[PDB]
Symmetry: C6
């Protein structure tokens, strides 16, 4: 919805957004939204995401698809009305994204998802890309484990000529929806086949906001299938714009750079990562 501000309430908003990244306990936002989600009546639509065609499928708090749901509305504070309706397994009325309010008045944040190696990491969409064919897959997995911390991270596999990899976009969105509804740390191996269909376009444009709102982080691998020309600069450009955080390779072996958006209108931070390979290509991110 829309929000109103004057100098005073605006300053409070900024302090709150600043705290959402810098001082809140890492992962607390995710814990909070998990709470909001479980307090939702069973069968109640909570998430809508677009499939390849352009239509959208809807899920309940347990990541189960909703096939039929009689039109229901809700009058928000802003005065705006929200309407959701599912007919034949497709949203008849509604919008894409979260169908229940997880944020409230606190919007424009990059909720800290975790802390590692002396650095806080934001939730939302994290794109790992750069000078093609490098080691993006090992990096997203190391990041997944690291930010997972005490928890296991979820792995969504898509569009690669390797065994067990799903190649159907609709199964893919089904996997992403379930992951964001149930896990704080998510890895997507290859956006390669997403970059274009309407469903695919709806994905780059929604994933980050959905994740940031939930308080979960989605770490996506994106190899510039294109040349190794300066098209990678175009990819890096597009990525920086649709990501909460960007991670790109450097000229130095095993070194990556992390560019983070700490929040709406807030300062963008940058820090470096040093890595090394172990047995069977397991990558380790050096801390202290």
């Amino acid at each position: 919805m829309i929000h109103l501000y004057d100098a005073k309430s605006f300053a409070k908003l900024r302090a709150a957004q600043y705290a959402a990244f810098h001082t809140d306990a890492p992962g607390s936002w995710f814990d909070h939204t998990s709470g909001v989600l479980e307090s939702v009546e069973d069968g109640t639509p909570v998430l809508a995401i677009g499939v390849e065609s352009g239509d959208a499928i809807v899920f309940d708090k347990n990541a189960q698809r909703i096939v039929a749901y009689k039109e229901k509305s809700v009058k928000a504070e802003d005065g705006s009305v929200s309407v959701v309706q599912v007919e034949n397994g497709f949203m008849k009325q509604g919008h894409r994204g979260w169908l229940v309010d997880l944020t409230g008045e606190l919007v424009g944040c990059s909720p800290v998802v975790a802390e590692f190696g002396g650095h806080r990491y934001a939730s939302g969409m994290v794109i790992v890309t750069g000078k093609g064919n490098s080691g993006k897959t090992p990096l997203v997995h190391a990041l997944g484990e690291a930010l997972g911390g005490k928890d296991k991270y979820a792995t969504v596999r898509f569009g690669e000529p390797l065994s067990g990899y799903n190649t159907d976009f609709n199964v893919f969105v089904d996997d992403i929806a379930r992951a964001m509804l149930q896990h704080r740390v998510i890895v997507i191996d290859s956006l390669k086949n997403v970059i274009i269909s309407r469903g695919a376009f709806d994905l780059l444009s929604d994933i980050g906001a959905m994740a940031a709102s939930r308080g979960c982080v989605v770490i996506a691998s994106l190899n510039p299938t294109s040349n190794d020309d300066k098209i990678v600069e175009l990819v890096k450009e597009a990525s920086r714009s649709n990501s909460t955080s960007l991670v790109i390779s450097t000229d130095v072996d095993g070194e990556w750079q992390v560019l983070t958006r700490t929040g709406e209108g807030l300062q963008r931070l940058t820090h470096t990562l040093q890595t090394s390979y172990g047995e069977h290509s397991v990558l380790t991110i050096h801390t202290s």
Copy 2:
């Protein structure tokens, strides 16, 4: 509708348009149209805006969507007939934009929306853009607060990978319509995802005229997602053409330039803005 002129009536028109920006009390036009809007019979369609598909949704003076409205016509002075009809929540007959006359014979104006730092600001569409990834978000908010003056400004959030940000174009237009119907100062954070669908195309082409007619100002952030090449010059070009006022960054830190169209065929003014950051990235525009 169409208007006729001879040397004399044309001169009066120009003087009136000139006064609408230079001498009228800042924000008086907005107060006037608020008056015209509240004098409209309840349920009467007053605003039509296009959604993604190309169809248009219609709103009444209270920013509530109209689902069904039996065909009704009106014979204007010009002799032209206006017809509006809403069927199944969509305009069956009518045109996009204001469905009730707010302007009358006084057209081609850039109604002064506010005065700040010794400069008058026009209503309509104000695009803030330039040398990418600068500080456009902090600037649109500082401008919003400044032009809001005694009033709070409204904030429409769209297409950014940050918490609580809507990413559905149809919710976005619903937010814009409500904002223009109820507030004099509006901020839109990111046209990034609007630049293309038919609904999106209808937006760049209508927003400015709708706002200028209402007497409200829409301050939109537009980061050249493109390279940092001279594509930003193309963006600045496109922006200057579809905006009532343009605000672009300079080579000098914190300095922005404001280019204003004071009215139909009238002189275009330019003035500079000096800014500085405070705590939590709150930006302040220096006055005296």
Copy 3:
């Protein structure tokens, strides 16, 4: 329809076309077609123009839209048959343009619309363009007043972010049709948003012939929204091809050049215009 010629009848045609611009009394052709139009039976379709979709709306001699009209045909001299039918406010059968014969055997003319400053001006489409962001709006208005002479000129406003400006293409064509049916001198402020939909494409391709046939002049502003590169040369190119007359800016302040097509296969004339601004940007074209 088609016409046949031999050396003799061809020479008579050329003399007649030559006279239509060089010797006829300025504006006489418009007076003549007004006569043909009012002698048409009420309700009889006289003009068809395309709307955005590609379909066409039809008007009667009083500029009122025709919603339903039972199929009717007419056998021309050429042996060709004309058929018109309107169903549900749209042409079921017919063609775009004038539905009644205004020209007869006298075709290929640029009927003199007016005389001013020692120069005759042709009817049809007049495009004012050139080195972007100059002063095209003040110029089309000064031209409108000047060619209007003793009469008021009509002003069609479209696609600009200023108050009261219509942005719906269908309202726009409705405005153009009414203007050509009722006034000799017409001004269109901004073709900016017309340059593309089928209706818009049908416009550039028809307007000039419709105007020239009626004997009215349509003066359209066209700012090269594009860069200030040599794309303006492309715009000037396209304009010269779809216009009866072209008016472009020069390197000299206030100076414009007028390029006129005096008729089918006839010589193209060129003359210069000197201008200056008065109060409130009212532009004056210097005569003697």
Copy 4:
């Protein structure tokens, strides 16, 4: 249909095609096909041409459109079957082009349409183009009169901002069909708006074959609306390929070059034309 050959019958074919241009009496082929056309049963479809949409309208020997015609077939020598059916004023079954056999075994000819200034001219499509904005209109008319000889030439006007010029593609094809069905020499002023819709595409691809088969000549003006760059070379290229004869301007004032295809696999001739203007831009082609 298809034809079979061996060295002997092939040689006879070539001699016959050679004679069709070099030795037959100018215009005899047209006289012959007029004979075949009038011997056709009334109401019988003889010509199908595509309209803008892609569908095709059908005409009888008197150039009257056929609205309904019950399916009828014909078994050709080749063993191939021809079927024609018109439903609701549109070809339900059939192909574009002549629906009755005008050529027979004699195909691949460029039937001499006329003789003038010591040169024979071929029937079919003649495109007049070259270094833009020159004097193409005066030239097509002079050519029309000259090749018309004792007869009047027909003039089809289309897509120009001059009085009485039709701008509807469907009226245009109706004009072309009637012209080819009733006249040996045809002039089309401006293919400008044809170069693209399916109907328009069907036109460039059919006109020449239709004309050549009838034995009539279609002289079409084509100004390279494009720049004056070497895009005119592209236009000249495209034109040479879809024309039976090409006429282009030279660096010498009033001088044009005529490139003629004398027939299938036959030698292509070239000759020059000298011209001068008289009163009211009437152009004269110098003979002796």
Copy 5:
């Protein structure tokens, strides 16, 4: 269908393919498939080819179109099932190409179609192209006569502005189907208008395989309507890829080069052709 191989059966396949071009009696394969075709039950679909829309028409062994044919299936050795069904003159079920097995286990061949001047020529698609506007038409005809030998060659005419030339793609495919079903040597004058609709695209992709399977040769003229730049190199590139044999012009007058694909994975041969013109442009290919 699919075929299985081990070193031994693969070697036999290659020897057989090698013999199909190098040692079989010229034209024997065509005689063999004629035999397979006439042994087919009357009315049985044998060939499917795509029309402009994308749909396909079906023919029986006598080149007569099939309008209705009740679904029928066949279980192949490979275990794959073949299904054919024609409803309303269009393939309801089936695939494009030959609907009856002409090849069997012997696939990947370029069956020798004829022998001339000390060189064997392959069946399939032969594209004659190169440095535009040369003498491609005379060459395809001389080749047709030469490879026809004791038999007459068939000539399919399409897309040229000459008398009797069909310009409807659907008549064209009807002509090609009939030709391949009844003649060993076929000439297609101009693929010019085929290079794009779905039917046209299906043609370049099928013609060669259809011809090679039948054992007939299709000699197609293809003039690079494009510039005379190095776009002809692009055309020559595309042609070499979709042809069984390529014939291109050289810098030497009357000299052409023949590049032949002798079979799947087999050596590509090249030989030169010397030609000269006789009376009425009849071209002769020099042998001894």
Copy 6:
């Protein structure tokens, strides 16, 4: 589905994937999936692949198409539900790819398909391409025989102007599905006509994952029909991205380079191949 990991389970996954290529007995994975496939209830859908339109056809374990199959669902461990339904020979519900689980928890592998010349080869998609018109066909066949070892390899022929070559995309996918369901080593001669329709696009994006999951290898020929410019670099680029293994030609005659992806995030190996031709172009790959 999605999988969860922590440092420990991730390390086990990598060791398992590493073993799937480096230590498992060559071809064991294929033997295993054959086992899973035959244990499937008859009539049960096991494979879905897209046809040209975009729809998908479904096959049972015996490579027979399924025309009708009543909706049935399955609840996976991940909590995700799988649904399959076939109506009128087309998937009403389901996704493309394997419809039965062949991999389980072991995903991201490049199962060793065979061993030859001292090198292990991965299953999945192997693209053979490079400096056009070289000897790709002989190479894919030699590779097929070599990796087939004791077994025969299957050959799918498509899109070449040679006898018996299918040119219908739907027959092609039918051939690929059958091949992967019944053979460990598959050869596809020419992807030339696949590079674009939706079905074709679904192919490049699925084939590798389908093959890798089955444990079979698909060796596809891909000649850069494009120029011999550096577009082949683009083709090689695209190929490396959608292939499990890439095989490209070098500047050295008969020498090819093999680039293999050994698994998810694992090291990419490279080795060279030396070849020579024997009789009838049978190519031999040199071992010791």
